[PDB]
């Protein structure tokens, strides 16, 4: 049960936030090692990206290596990080790019595993 006071406990929110910005940096720099580190290592993990639907860490890894590295840098905007209790978080952000005209959105659900905070599901898309 999630009680109202259990939302956004300062310390939980600091850990998750650092983790989020660390993922942000790995993503824009194409640090595939870390991008793999931060994702949950399981067959149930899901990543819906702009042009692909990926199920399991195996497919997400294939994706990562097959992905073009040019124009990965992006500016975030309207970022909302909300924690629930001591081991669950939702990071939501919009983003834009120097090249594009469309607006990007990214939603990620983080869970604290024994190995650390891990993204168990992510959806990334361009707004119509």
Would you tell me which residues interact with a second copy (CB under 8 A)?
Answer: 1-3, 7, 42, 44, 46, 48, 50-53, 55, 78, 80, 82, 84-88, 90, 92, 94, 103, 105, 107, 109, 111-114, 120-123, 125-128
Residue 89: CB atoms within 10 A of its CB come to 24
Where along the sequence are the contacts to Cl ion (CB under 5 A)? 43, 56-58
Q: 107 with 95: CB under 8 angstroms? A: no
| Helix ranges restricted to H, 29-84 | 32-38, 57-66
58 binds, among a second copy, Cl ion, none (CB under 5 to 8 A by kind): Cl ion
Binding partner of residue 28 among Cl ion, a second copy, none, CB cut-off 5 to 8 Å per kind: none
**Least separation in angstroms between CB 11 and a second copy:** 14
Closest CA relative to residue 8, chosen from 77, 78, 91: 91
The rounded distance, in Å, linking the Cα atoms of 39 and 36 is: 5
Q: Which is nearer to a second copy, 25 or 78 (CB)?
A: 78
């Amino acid at each position: 049960g999630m009680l109202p006071d259990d939302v956004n406990q300062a310390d939980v929110l600091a850990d998750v936030t650092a983790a989020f910005y660390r993922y942000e940096k790995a993503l824009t720099g194409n640090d595939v090692a870390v991008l793999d580190e931060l994702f949950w290592h399981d067959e149930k993990t899901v990543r819906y990206g702009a042009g692909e639907n990926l199920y399991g860490i195996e497919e997400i890894r294939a994706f990562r290596l097959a992905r073009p590295s040019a124009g990965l840098d992006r500016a975030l905007r309207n970022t909302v990080i909300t924690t629930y209790g001591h081991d669950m978080a939702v990071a939501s952000t919009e983003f834009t790019r120097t090249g594009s005209t469309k607006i990007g959105r990214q939603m990620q659900t983080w869970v604290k595993m024994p190995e650390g905070w891990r993204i168990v599901a992510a959806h990334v898309s361009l707004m119509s």
